[PDB]
Amino acid sequence: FPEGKVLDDMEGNQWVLGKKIGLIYLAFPTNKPEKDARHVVKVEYQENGPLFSELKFYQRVAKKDCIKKWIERKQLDYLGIPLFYGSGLTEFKGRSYRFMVMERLGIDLQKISGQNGTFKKSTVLQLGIRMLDVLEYIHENEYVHGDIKAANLLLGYKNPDQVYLADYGLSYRYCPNGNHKQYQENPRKGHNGTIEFTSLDAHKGVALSRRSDVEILGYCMLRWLCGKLPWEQNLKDPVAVQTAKTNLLDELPQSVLKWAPSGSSCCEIAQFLVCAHSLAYDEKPNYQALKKILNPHGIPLGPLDFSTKGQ
Ligand SMILES: CC(C)(C)c1cc(Nc2ccnc(Nc3ccc(CC#N)cc3)n2)[nH]n1
């Protein structure tokens, strides 16, 4: 797509592409463009199906003013959901592409991870809390993410200290108009998600519900703290991963307590996974209890620490 190509979204706002960075470009509004881009445009084929799933999520859930009301009521410094500005179709060389105009963000956490994709314990716990805030909000709004992992956490651009959950490509409306999906194992559609982190429900082909996002976040924090998960050697074998995950949850808390090196306790992560595994399929997580598990002293959250000293 040429720099300067002008996109018109469904609301009739016009967007001029910048430089590429699927395909993702800097973007500016035609009307009152700032020096510096605060928007990006994500582009994919119209048939491109994950972008459409994303569009549904963002259009339904990422309402700037609703988030603003939530942040204020819940006393959050921020919520790690990127803002959504518009969507539409554009044509280039005979084909029609769907695009979404999104808040500009910075670097993904996979890139800025230390030794063997690890973060300092304080950073792990804070990331967990920030994600619980996102989960509570999207869950309240009938959606689950299904794919929390470092590559889908991005730091802000305009605010580089804030962390954002992105890529709602596997997001799922689990409770459309308050009707919670039924539990059904589909043995034709098992083992979806990122195999390293996906939930047992996903392994069994069960429609994602709230507990699955909490479970996945638990696997993530264990991976971020300890540096590799018990199934590291099994990733090309989904069944074996399922088995390893089953055993880990079945043998909590010790499965997790034992895994940790002498430095970094998994006490918080163990109890987190205990809480997560206690949930019924249609059950609402105790997000406040979970946040407290990760922040036992109730410290204010401060800068994320990505330092690498000595490695
Ligand atoms: C390419 C770059 C990372 C510099 C980036 C991303 C954004 N902004 C937004 C806003 C909403 N959704 C997305 N998707 C998204 C998710 C993850 C990655 C990277 C990995 N893994 C890229 C894009 N991006 N601005 N700049």
Domain end: 71, 105, 139, which one? 105
Does residue 288 share a domain with residue 181?
Answer: yes
Does residue 113 share a domain with residue 82?
Answer: no
Does residue 179 share a domain with residue 96?
Answer: no
Residue to mutate (ligand 1; options 59, 105, 220; most atoms within 8 A of CB):
105
Query: Ligand 1 centroid vs 154 CA: distance in angstroms?
Result: 7
Asked if 119 and 220 count as a contact pair (C-beta separation under 8 A), the reply is no
**b/e map 21-39, b = 16+ CB within 10 Å:** eeebbbbbbeeeeeeebbb
- The residues pairing with 164 across neighbouring beta strands, listed in sequence order, are 154
The token pair at 41 is 């445009």
Residue to mutate (ligand 1; options 44, 61, 84, 154; most atoms within 8 A of CB):
154
- Neighbour-count burial of 288, counting CB atoms closer than 10 A to its CB (0-12 exposed, 13-18 middle, 19+ buried): exposed
Does residue 110 share a domain with residue 93?
Answer: no
Does residue 159 share a domain with residue 27?
Answer: no
Query: Ligand 1 centroid vs 105 CA: distance in angstroms?
Result: 6
Q: How far is CA 303 from the centre of its chain?
A: 20
Does residue 85 share a domain with residue 179?
Answer: no
Asked if 44 and 35 count as a contact pair (C-beta separation under 8 A), the reply is no
Omega before residue 33 within 30° of 0, cis: no
Does residue 39 share a domain with residue 8?
Answer: yes
| Region label for 17, one of left (φ > 0), alpha (ψ between -120 and 50) or beta (otherwise) | beta
Provide the 10 A C-beta neighbour count for residue 158.
11
Active site residue: 147, 167, 201, 213, which one? 147
Asked if 246 and 255 count as a contact pair (C-beta separation under 8 A), the reply is no
Asked if 122 and 307 count as a contact pair (C-beta separation under 8 A), the reply is no
The token pair at 270 is 């163990």
Does residue 222 share a domain with residue 194?
Answer: yes
Question: Which structural domain, as residue segments, surrounds residue 58?
Answer: 1-105
When divided into structural domains, the chain yields a total of 2
How far, in Å, CA of 38 to CA of 213, rounded? 29
How far, in Å, CA of 67 to CA of 286, rounded? 20
Mapped to the 3 state alphabet, what secondary structure does 245-310 carry? HHHHHHCCCHHHHCCCCCCCCCHHHHHHHHHHHCCCCCCCCCHHHHHHHHCCCCCCCCCCCCCCCC
The token pair at 297 is 């002293």
Domain end: 105, 134, 151, which one? 105
Query: Ligand 1 centroid vs 26 CA: distance in angstroms?
Result: 11
Domain end: 77, 105, 133, which one? 105
Which residue type occupies 34?
Answer: E
* Torsion angle, alpha carbons of 91, 169, 125, 139, to 10: 120
How far, in Å, CA of 170 to CA of 191, rounded? 13
Asked if 179 and 98 count as a contact pair (C-beta separation under 8 A), the reply is no
One DSSP character per residue, the chain reads --TT-EEE-TTS-EEEEEEE--EEEEEEESSS--SS--EEEEEEESS-HHHHHHHHHHHHH--HHHHHHHHHHTT-S------EEEEEEEEETTEEEEEEEEE-EEEETTTT--GGG---HHHHHHHHHHHHHHHHHHHHTTEE-S--SGGGEEEESSSTT-EEE--GGG-EESSGGG-PPPP---TTS-S-S-TTT--HHHHTTPPP-HHHHHHHHHHHHHHHHHSS-TTGGGTT-HHHHHHHHHHHHHTTTHHHHTTS-SSS--HHHHHHHHHHHT--TTPPP-HHHHHHHH-TT-PPP-------TT-
Please say if 147 is a catalytic residue. Answer: yes
- The residues pairing with 15 across neighbouring beta strands, listed in sequence order, are 7, 29
Q: Is the dihedral of CA 47, 40, 74, 132 positive or negative?
A: positive
Q: Which residues line ligand 1 (CB under 6 A)?
A: 21, 24, 40, 82, 102-105, 108, 110, 151-152, 154, 166-167
How far, in Å, CA of 266 to CA of 223, rounded? 11
Nearest CA to ligand 1 atom 6: 105
Nearest CA to ligand 1 atom 17: 152
> Reported resolution in A?
1.9
Q: Which atom of ligand 1 is nearest to the CA of 54?
A: 12
The token pair at 231 is 């199934």
Known binding positions? 21-24, 42
> Beta strand 23-29 with 6-8: parallel, antiparallel or unpaired?
unpaired
The token pair at 193 is 């998600």
Asked if 256 and 247 count as a contact pair (C-beta separation under 8 A), the reply is no
End-to-end CA distance of the chain: 41
Does residue 110 share a domain with residue 67?
Answer: no
How far, in Å, CA of 90 to CA of 159, rounded? 30
Does residue 113 share a domain with residue 85?
Answer: no
Query: Ligand 1 centroid vs 141 CA: distance in angstroms?
Result: 23
Does residue 60 share a domain with residue 133?
Answer: no
How far, in Å, CA of 96 to CA of 98, rounded? 7
Known binding positions for ATP? 21-24, 42
Which residue type occupies 138?
Answer: I
Q: What technique was this entry resolved by? A: X-ray
Query: Ligand 1 centroid vs 68 CA: distance in angstroms?
Result: 22
Does residue 43 share a domain with residue 111?
Answer: no
Q: How far is CA 260 from the centre of its chain?
A: 24
